[PDB]
From a paper:
We present the cryoelectron microscopy (cryo-EM) structure at 3.5 Å of human C5 in complex with the previously characterized tick inhibitors OmCI and RaCI, as well as a member of the CirpT family (CirpT1). As OmCI and RaCI lock C5 into a less-flexible conformation, our approach targeted the full C5–OmCI–RaCI–CirpT1 complex. The complex was imaged on a Titan Krios and a 3D reconstruction was generated at a nominal overall resolution of 3.5 Å from 118,365 particles. The volume generated allowed us to dock and refine the previously determined crystal structure of the C5, OmCI, and RaCI1 complex. As observed in the ternary complex crystal structures, local resolution varied across C5 within the complex, with the C345c domain being the least well-ordered part of the complex (5 to 6 Å). However, domains buried within the core of the C5 demonstrated features consistent with the experimentally determined local resolution of 3.35 Å, including detailed sidechain density. By comparing the expected density from the crystal structure of the C5–OmCI–RaCI complex to our newly generated map, we identified an extra density in the lower right corner of the complex, which we attributed to CirpT1. The local resolution in this area was worse than for the overall complex (4 to 5 Å), indicating a higher level of flexibility. However, the residual density suggested that the main interaction between C5 and CirpT1 was mediated through binding to C5_MG4 (C5 residues L349 to S458). Mapping of the residues involved in CVF binding onto the C5 structure reveals extensive overlap with the CirpT binding site and superposition of the C5–OmCI–RaCI–CirpT and C5–CVF structures confirms major steric clashes between CirpT and CVF.
The 3 pathways all converge at the activating cleavage of C3 into C3a and C3b, and the subsequent activating cleavage of C5 into C5a and C5b. C3b and its inactivated form iC3b function as opsonins for phagocytes, while C5b initiates the terminal pathway by assembly of the pore-forming membrane attack complex (MAC, C5b-C9). To address the need for a more detailed understanding of the mechanisms of C5 activation, we have identified and characterized a family of C5 inhibitors from tick saliva, hereafter named the CirpT (complement inhibitor from Rhipicephalus pulchellus of the terminal pathway) family. Analysis of the specific binding interactions between C5 and CirpT1 suggests that the CirpT family functions by direct steric blocking of the docking of C5 onto the C5-convertase, and our data thus provide support for previous models of C5 activation, which include convertase binding through C5 domains MG4, MG5, and MG7.
Author numbering:
A (entry chain E): 5 to 86
B (entry chain D): 14 to 59
C (entry chain C): 22 to 168
D (entry chain B): 20 to 611, 620 to 670
E (entry chain A): 680 to 873, 879 to 1388, 1400 to 1676
The structure:
């Protein structure tokens, strides 16, 4: 579903990992809003495992609604199908 | 009037307008009437 | 160019061998018929020739036939009993105009020219020769009479 | 910080009312500013100027309708190609070198028939509209250009209502056959031009009528091996030819513009016409084996120029008929993008709305579409996303996608391909693309989109566009904006306050009549802070249903499927307001065709459906310049703004 | 096949690609070497032509037709490029009108009669934008409707079959019967009932057609109305058609003009002039001698009347189109009308506005200035035949015409510059003359072959100096002024001594156009004033003939197209020198040489004589026009009083109906009015004309009919053998015959072309040419096909004439039916055949009561009654003429015929029971006759038609039964004359 992307040389401070102005602890999987991901960092090698919302492929009779309010997974494009 | 080299030119607007030779000559632009630009020749009048 | 022409005169050759119509342009006879015109009306038989002379009188286009007999420079035209002896005294170099002289107690001079039209200089020489021969007598213009 | 934004159409138009907009922010006191167009480069002469009043009641926005009078410009050798737009105020003052063009207005030559025979009169009338799309009332000049290229006529006729009917042109009795050319043009100071074509072909009385009707107008994947051609031949309207010898010649063609053709002397087949109808089959594959073309993959976009010669038996007569071209189509579908900016906002769902078309440009549905995505990050570490599948809705032909990307993405090389139920892999339609990221010196971006995609917004409705900012400093954004271009004129402006408790905001836009048939909506705000403010802009393209202000409607009374010759019938014309109506009635046989809205759209200086590389480029694509104490860049390069 | 693809491959991209293609065309009649003699496209094209031709001709032996047609396909598609032409003709779009709509406007109209599917397109232009409204269609059609194909004309006597077809559009068949409105003049198979032929109800299958035929036989002349009533179960449609009936024989048009000068400014007062009524010799029986009259006010009256109407083109109608000079005779009359009205300011001649008429004139003048743009090449030269090579003659002529019009319609100064430079840079030798690029022979000049070269170079130099001196005020460069100095020097040095008056007059003119003070030009104009002719003393008329004096002395009796060219050139040489004392007779001649309509004999004398007439009418003061011209027959009533004034000064024509002499007269007034009468007779034979061509024409039958018409020039005295000038081969087609246009195209289209143009208009076939050879013939072969069946076919003509000398002509009759003699018509279906002929009484009938002879003799309607004896029978393939001598005279109402004199009888060949045997005696009585002037006396011709009584009268007495017959004959003969009941 939701792919992942790993960044290198992330700003790690006081054991906490701040990335794109989002402070996340070392062994903490926190849901975020800006950007809308589910992230986890590691100050040992300064890398951040982060996953996106799954890309939506809209089939018949469906449509997509997305509002940036709230954190993952509510900030994800939802495959709303009546 | 051995060297004035009149020519068919576009206007500052887009109408094809043959430039004018000095006061005592006349411009004759050989070749087809649509080839623009094209360097013409100046002939006398008398 | 000079215009002493067609010497000697031959009343046949001076008539274009009877194939072309002639009109009367000048005459010292004050009885000159109006629009008088005599064309060959037949073939040349033994020294004779038919000539249907059409002329005008008032409004009538009369047509009186004649008979022309030729001997050198002289001619005798006769219709019924009336007789006239004409002699071609001068004839243009190309037979376009000739001046006729009718014989009587006072000789009158007539001048004929092709109907189809004659060369302009030869007609001028015919007129000069006539005016010389007429010697100041008053001339009519039979073709200037509403033809 | 105190900011100001001036927005003027990218190209000032000589003789047009070039509306300028001024929007200032931060200033709280009422004040006056005089926007002015000034000469180049010394600012010596004021071609025009305007006064605006900026107050709290006016929301510190106002528009100054400036106008470069046509006669106020030099002539001869050097008419100005640049003017200075200039603003004055007790606070600020800015100037920018703006281009000007004389191409103002439109001329549509309308010849009654597109094909004339010798000694017929060419009825030609010209419509003259200015850039405001109103009757121009200017003196026009035609110029009938013979096929060889030498003007054979020039006739001026003053306008009074916008419809300039000209004295008819008599085609000589021995004309010069070919494709003549008419060139309407304005007589004074305007470079506006209009052009129409009409062929003059010699009438040749035919022994009989030969008609060709192919199976389909396109040779797809199936009929590439067999192609049924129906060749009918008939005498004068329902006298069926008895028996004839039908000689057919086939040749591959490149383009319908140049009449070049390459024959195939391997399949010059002939048959026997029997009782009016003879049908043959053309095996395209074995026939093209001359140079062999090596596959169906070649010959794409080419035409099959069919030549038929019917020589009947009885009278020894001969007649010829042709098909100019039968386009080869490699795939029964065509893909294109609708309502998708080819520019990526890092951190925003990138919606891809692919649209499937047949070869007749009709929106087919139910066609599954697959889409893969190759991305290029700032570290150049290309990442591949999983293939997603969307099937086209049968309502509008749009198969929606949503392709979320990581933050570090710059160039998305996404590729859409049709996945039909019955087509092999080769016969599927595929289209690749390349979406670049919004380049911003800060981390500020904007993304706007309206309600839905499958209705083609209709005039009279209201537009609920949802503007969504995404940035740090988001809780300091004070005012939004919106400029609504149309035909190159800024017909709107305003400001909507941002609710500092919500992330996005629903902007309500009243759709008016000026916005028909296509308008752009530019929206932006001001990120401020340390030593600099920043404009962050994102534009969209609103396609509105082509509706008139004065909807014209003609009826024939009485209405029936057939009339009789000489019958007296009435034509009933009904409009919306008092409006002139030109008329014409031509034989429908000449058409085997007047499309103005495509020619009437060359006034929209924009390009593409929105987005842009950076801020200034989002403007310069929508056809706006801008003056701002904040970031300003992207000079003209007036040659080819966008295609 | 393989020897076709080698050609199609070798010459795909070559420069001369049309050459060998039109050398590969099929021509079963001439060798590839004989055709190569006609190429003028250089040694490359001749070589490609010869090679491609021999390799195409060698193949066509022992070949199946499929391969031949596939080869013609290969050729016609591979070698050429394309062809602009359409197979359908599209009606004129109507409703082209702009209508202000006050929010609603209903307008009504009438759909045109055609069967189309109209499309109405409203484009509303309002202050809110353009609105291409929805197109509302309108499909007009009739579901069942009859349509006929009536021939253009019909030579009277011939039995036409008016083919037709009833078209049905409904899928379900129906009943229908067609019936023709039998007009009394149109003899049909059936007879009227109350007036329609019987109609039998026939059935046509649905969604198809059905042939319909009708056999008529016209017997009267003039447009006859003919209806066709399609009587069906759903209506009765009456389709009016007009069947034009033309008299037999050829048409001959002979004019006669008179200038009425009641005040005498022409040096001769002329108030009364008599137009005699001369019945020509060979005339078609039962035919009137039509003779229109036309009296026009001004000197330029005829030109004005032609232009100021919808005719505007009557200056050429006897000559064919196609060359560029035709599209210049289209704009010479309008230009000269314009130049007269303008440089005189006679605009008030109209009661209308002087602005609308000026605008219409300028419109016609411009629409004319463009018809020649089609004949201009890439290098701004003009070419005579569209597509032919560039010609020095016609470039100079087009320059003259365009440099004259530049006064009122500003011409493109750069195009005239380019044309003048093309002339004076390529086509001017070192001596000064001009040479012709093409091989167009515009005129045939006399003399030996070197002297003809001299004369032709002189004519071309002078003609081009005229063209340049007229178009030189547009583009007054110095290059061409030096060219004109050189050419005028050539003329001055090489005109005298002359070799023909024509080139002397054109040289005097072209030299007067420039510097009129060169002592040599005085000598030229003097030696031209000397060649003059005159009629009268002081001259009433003055003209010049086409030949010198020292070469020919005979003065012509009629006007020839070189006489008017030379007269107009000398008149213009005089007017250029302001000799108004000297041109008053020349103008009189030229104004009588005019022809009703405006023009003159050819296209050159027309332009020059119109220029003379106009440059004169503008140069001498206008005299007030006020006359009361009273035209009236001699022994009849007044025809039509003409009240001449500037109010009405263009009195329309008046068909002179009655067959008496005509007399025009006027009262004392002021003006100068010219009275033209136009005699239009229909001659039966053409041996009585001097014809200058050898003609033979056949209708050969083809196996896999075909007219084979040839011609040849007969060079007159002191001429060369180079053939004719531009000639015009006019091949009239018999009724119901139609030429196969593809053969004519194959003759004209190729680069081996024989005929430089063609056109099939109204049943004629008018081919043109650059020359017809004097050494040997020149044969045109084109297939013909019977378009419908016609019986009793009357021969149609085949005329060839020169184009700039329409008197150098020859006519020949020919029929496409060798159908055998017409001894009898064999019974039924004949009541129309003999409807209007004479019927001989049965040989030696005794049932005659001898009282019918009494009553028929004393009828006032019967004119002549006497017995003759046929001496010889002679046929002119249209009628037969019976030479007979008058034996015994019995009655004569009109003028009498002398005893034992020769009288000629005439009857139609297609008349059966009226045969006459040579030498046998017959008694003849019939209607009136004709008096013909046989150049020395009267002669009488008598037609043998209906109501002409004829009986056989044997001379012997060994009949044993006709003793009482001859008894009644002789007693009636002795009693007819002394009483006259
Ligand atoms: C052929 O048909 C026409 C009508 O189409 C007949 O018409 C003429 O006389 C009629 C009176 O009987 C009128 O009603 C028509 O208007 C008139 N038509 C014209 C053109 O003048 C005509 O008589 C018929 N032909 C014959 C010989 O009778």
């Amino acid at each position: 579903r939701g792919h992942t992307y790993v960044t290198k040389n992330v700003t790690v401070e006081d054991g906490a990992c701040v990335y794109l102005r989002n402070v996340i602890p070392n062994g903490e999987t926190k849901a975020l809003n800006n950007p809308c991901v589910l992230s986890t960092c590691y100050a040992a090698d300064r890398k951040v495992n982060s996953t996106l919302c799954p890309n939506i492929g809209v089939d018949e009779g469906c449509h997509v609604e997305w509002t940036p309010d709230g954190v993952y997974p509510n900030c994800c494009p939802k495959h709303v199908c009546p | 009037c051995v060297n004035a080299t009149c020519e068919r030119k576009l206007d500052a607007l887009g109408n094809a307008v043959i430039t004018k030779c000095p006061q005592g000559c006349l411009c004759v632009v050989r070749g087809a009437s649509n080839i623009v630009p094209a360097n013409g020749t100046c002939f006398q009048l008398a | 160019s000079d215009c002493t022409g067609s010497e000697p005169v031959d009343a046949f050759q001076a008539f274009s061998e009877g194939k072309e119509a002639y009109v009367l342009v000048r005459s010292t006879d004050p009885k000159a018929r109006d629009c008088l015109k005599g064309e060959p009306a037949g073939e040349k038989q033994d020294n004779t020739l038919p000539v249907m002379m059409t002329f005008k009188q008032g409004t009538d286009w009369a047509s009186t036939d004649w008979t022309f007999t030729l001997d050198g420079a002289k001619v005798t035209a006769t219709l019924g009993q009336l007789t006239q002896n004409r002699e071609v005294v001068y004839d243009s170099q190309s037979h376009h105009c000739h001046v006729d002289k009718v014989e009587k107690e006072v000789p009158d001079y007539e001048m004929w020219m092709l109907d189809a039209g004659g060369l302009e200089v030869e007609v001028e020489c015919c007129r000069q020769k006539l005016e010389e021969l007429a010697s100041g007598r008053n001339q009519m213009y039979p073709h200037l009479k509403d033809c | 910080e105190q900011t100001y934004v001036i927005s003027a159409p990218k190209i000032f138009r000589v003789g047009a009312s070039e509306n300028i907009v001024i929007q200032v922010y931060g200033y709280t006191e009422a004040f006056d500013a005089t926007i002015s167009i000034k000469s180049y480069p010394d600012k010596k002469f004021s071609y025009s100027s305007g006064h605006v009043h900026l107050s709290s009641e006016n929301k510190f926005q106002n528009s100054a309708i400036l106008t470069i009078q046509p006669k106020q410009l030099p002539g001869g050798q050097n008419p100005v190609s640049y003017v200075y737009l200039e603003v004055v105020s007790k606070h600020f003052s800015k100037s920018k070198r703006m281009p000007i063009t004389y191409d103002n207005g439109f001329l549509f030559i309308h010849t009654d028939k597109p094909v004339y025979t010798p000694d017929q009169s060419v009825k030609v009338r010209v419509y003259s509209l200015n850039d405001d799309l109103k009757p121009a009332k200017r003196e026009t000049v035609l110029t009938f250009i013979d096929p060889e290229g030498s003007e054979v006529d020039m006739v001026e006729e003053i306008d009074h209502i916008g419809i300039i009917s000209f004295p008819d042109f008599k085609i000589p009795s021995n004309p010069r056959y070919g494709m003549w050319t008419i060139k309407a043009k304005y007589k004074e100071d305007f470079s506006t031009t209009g052009t129409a074509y009409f062929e003059v072909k010699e009438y040749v009385l035919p022994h009989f009528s030969v008609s060709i009707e192919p199976e389909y107008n396109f040779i797809g994947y199936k009929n590439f091996k067999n192609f049924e051609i129906t060749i009918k031949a008939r005498y004068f309207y329902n006298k069926v030819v008895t028996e004839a010898d039908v000689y057919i010649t086939f040749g591959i063609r490149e383009d319908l513009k140049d009449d070049q053709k390459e024959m195939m002397q391997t399949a010059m087949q002939n048959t026997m016409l029997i009782n009016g109808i003879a049908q043959v089959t053309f095996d395209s594959e074995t026939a093209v084996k001359e140079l062999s073309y090596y596959s169906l993959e070649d010959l794409n976009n080419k035409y099959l120029y069919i030549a038929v010669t019917v020589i009947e038996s009885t009278g020894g007569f001969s007649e010829e008929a042709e098909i100019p071209g039968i386009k080869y189509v490699l795939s029964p579908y065509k893909l294109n993008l609708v309502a998708t900016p080819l520019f990526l906002k890092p951190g925003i769902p990138y919606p891809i709305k692919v649209q499937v078309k047949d070869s007749l440009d009709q929106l087919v549905g139910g066609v599954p579409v697959t889409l893969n995505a190759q991305t290029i990050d700032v570290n150049q570490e290309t990442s591949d996303l999983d293939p997603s599948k969307s099937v086209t809705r049968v309502d509008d032909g749009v198969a929606s996608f949503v392709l979320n990307l990581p933050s570090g993405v710059t160039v998305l090389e996404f590729n859409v391909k049709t996945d039909a139920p019955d087509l092999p892999e080769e016969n599927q339609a595929r289209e690749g693309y390349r979406a670049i990221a919004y380049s911003s010196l800060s981390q500020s971006y904007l993304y706007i989109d309206w309600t839905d995609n499958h209705k083609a917004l209709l005039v009279g409705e209201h537009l609920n566009i949802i503007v969504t900012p995404k940035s740090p400093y988001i809780d300091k954004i004070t005012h939004y904006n919106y400029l609504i271009l149309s035909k190159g004129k800024i017909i709107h402006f305003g400001t909507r306050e941002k609710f500092s408790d919500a992330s996005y905001q629903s902007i309500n836009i009243p759709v008016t009549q000026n916005m028909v048939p296509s308008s752009r909506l530019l929206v932006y705000y001001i990120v401020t802070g340390e030593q600099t403010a920043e404009l962050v802009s994102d534009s969209v393209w609103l396609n509105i249903e082509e509706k008139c202000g004065n909807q014209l409607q003609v009826h024939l009374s009485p209405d029936a499927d057939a009339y009789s010759p000489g019958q007296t019938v009435s034509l009933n014309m009904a409009t919306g307001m008092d409006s002139w109506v030109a008329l014409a009635a031509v034989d429908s046989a000449v058409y085997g065709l007047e499309r103005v809205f495509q020619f009437l759209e060359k006034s929209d200086l924009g390009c593409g459906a929105g987005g842009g590389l950076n801020n200034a480029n989002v403007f310069h694509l929508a056809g706006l310049t801008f003056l701002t104490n904040a970031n300003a860049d992207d000079s003209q390069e007036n040659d080819e703004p966008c295609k | 096949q393989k020897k076709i693809e080698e050609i199609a491959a070798k010459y795909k991209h070559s420069v001369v690609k049309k050459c060998c293609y039109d050398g590969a065309c099929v021509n079963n009649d001439e060798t590839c070497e004989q055709r190569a003699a006609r190429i003028s496209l250089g040694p490359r094209c001749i070589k490609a032509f010869t090679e491609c031709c021999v390799v195409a001709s060698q193949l066509r032996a022992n070949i199946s037709h499929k391969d031949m047609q596939l080869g013609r396909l290969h050729m016609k598609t591979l070698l050429p490029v394309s062809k602009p032409e359409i197979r359908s003709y599209f009606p004129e779009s109507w409703l082209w009108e702009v209508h202000l709509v006050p929010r609603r406007k209903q307008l009504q109209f009438a759909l045109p009669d055609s069967l189309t599917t109209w499309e109405i397109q409203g484009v509303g232009i309002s202050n809110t934008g353009i609105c291409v409204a929805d197109t509302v269609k309108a499909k007009v059609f009739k579901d069942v409707f009859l349509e006929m194909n009536i021939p253009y004309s019909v030579v009277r006597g011939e039995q036409i079959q008016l083919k037709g077809t009833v078209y049905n559009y409904r899928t379900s068949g129906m009943q229908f019967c067609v019936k023709m409105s039998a007009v009394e003049g149109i003899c049909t198979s059936e007879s009227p009932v109350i007036k329609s032929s019987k109609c039998v109800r026939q059935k046509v299958e649905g969604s198809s057609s059905h042939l319909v035929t009708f056999t008529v036989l016209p017997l009267e002349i003039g447009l006859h109305n003919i209806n066709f009533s399609l009587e069906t179960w759903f209506g009765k449609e009456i389709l009016v058609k007009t069947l034009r009936v033309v008299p037999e024989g050829v048409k001959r048009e002979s004019y006669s003009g008179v200038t009425l000068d009641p005040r005498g400014i022409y040096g001769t007062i002329s108030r009364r002039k008599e137009f005699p009524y001369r019945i020509p010799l060979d005339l078609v029986p039962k035919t009137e001698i039509k003779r229109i009259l036309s009296v026009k006010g001004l000197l330029v009256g005829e030109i004005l009347s032609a232009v100021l109407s919808q005719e505007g083109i009557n200056i050429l109608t006897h000559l064919p189109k196609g060359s560029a000079e035709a599209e210049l005779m289209s704009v010479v009359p309008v230009f000269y009308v314009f130049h007269y009205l303008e440089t005189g300011n006679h605009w008030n001649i109209f009661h209308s506005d002087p602005l609308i008429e000026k605008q219409k004139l300028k419109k016609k003048l411009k629409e004319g200035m463009l018809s020649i743009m089609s004949y201009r090449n890439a290098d701004y030269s003009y070419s005579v035949w569209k597509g032919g090579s560039a010609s020095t003659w016609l470039t100079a002529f087009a320059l003259r015409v365009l440099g004259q019009v530049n006064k009122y319609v500003e011409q493109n100064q750069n195009s005239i510059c380019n044309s003048l430079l093309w002339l004076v840079e390529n086509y001017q030798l070192d001596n000064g003359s001009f040479k012709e690029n093409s091989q167009y022979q515009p005129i045939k000049l006399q003399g030996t072959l070197p002297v003809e070269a001299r004369e032709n170079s002189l004519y071309l130099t002078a003609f081009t100096v005229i063209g340049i001196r007229k178009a030189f005020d547009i583009c007054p460069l110095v290059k061409i002024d030096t060219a004109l100095i050189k050419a005028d020097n050539f003329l001055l040095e090489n005109t005298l001594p002359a070799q023909s008056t024509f080139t002397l007059a054109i040289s005097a003119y072209a030299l007067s156009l420039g510097d009129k003070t060169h002592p040599q030009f005085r000598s030229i104009v003097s030696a031209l004033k000397r060649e003059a002719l005159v009629k009268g003393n002081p001259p009433i008329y003055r003209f010049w003939k086409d030949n010198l004096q020292h070469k020919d002395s005979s003065v012509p009796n009629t006007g020839t197209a070189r006489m008017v060219e030379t007269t107009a050139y000398a008149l213009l040489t005089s007017l250029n020198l302001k000799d108004i004392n000297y041109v008053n007779p020349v103008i009189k001649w030229l104004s009588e040489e005019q022809r009703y309509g405006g023009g003159f004999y050819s296209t050159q004398d027309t332009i020059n004589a119109i220029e003379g007439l106009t440059e004169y009418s503008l140069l001498v003061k206008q005299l007030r026009l006020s006359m009361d011209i009273d035209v009236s027959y001699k022994h009849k009533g007044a025809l039509h009083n003409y009240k001449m004034t500037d109010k009405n000064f263009l009195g329309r024509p008046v068909e002179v109906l009655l067959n008496d002499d005509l007399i025009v007269s006027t009262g004392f007034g002021s003006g100068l009015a010219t009275v033209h009468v136009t005699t239009v007779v229909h001659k039966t034979s053409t041996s009585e004309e001097v014809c200058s061509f050898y003609l033979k024409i056949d209708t050969q039958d083809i196996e896999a009919k075909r007219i084979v018409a040839c011609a040849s020039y007969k060079p007159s005295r002191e001429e060369s053998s180079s053939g004719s000038s531009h000639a015009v081969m006019d091949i009239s087609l018999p009724t119901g015959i139609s030429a196969n246009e593809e053969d004519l195209k194959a003759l004209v289209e190729g680069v081996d072309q024989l005929f430089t143009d063609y056109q099939i208009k109204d049943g004629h076939v008018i081919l043109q040419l650059n020359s017809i050879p004097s050494s040997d013939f020149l044969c045109v072969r084109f297939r013909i096909f019977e378009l419908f069946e016609v019986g009793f076919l009357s021969p149609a003509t085949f005329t060839v004439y020169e184009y700039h000398r329409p008197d150098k002509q020859c006519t020949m009759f020919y029929s496409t039916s060798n159908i055998k003699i017409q001894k009898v018509c064999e019974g039924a279906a004949c009541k129309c055949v003999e409807a209007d002929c004479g019927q001989m009484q049965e040989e030696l009938d005794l049932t005659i009561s001898a009282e019918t002879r009494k009553q028929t003799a004393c009828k006032p309607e019967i004119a002549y009654a006497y017995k003759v004896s046929i001496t010889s029978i002679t046929v002119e393939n249209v009628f037969v003429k019976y030479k007979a001598t008058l034996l015994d005279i019995y009655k004569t109402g009109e003028a009498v015929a002398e005893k034992d004199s020769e009288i000629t009888f005439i009857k139609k060949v297609t008349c059966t029971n009226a045969e006459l045997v040579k030498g046998r005696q017959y008694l003849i009585m019939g209607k009136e006759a004709l008096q013909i002037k046989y150049n020395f006396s009267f002669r009488y011709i008598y037609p043998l038609d209906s109501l002409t009584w004829i009986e056989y009268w044997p001379r012997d007495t060994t009949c044993s039964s006709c003793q009482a017959f001859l008894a009644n004959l002789d007693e009636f003969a002795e009693d007819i004359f002394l009483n006259g009941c």
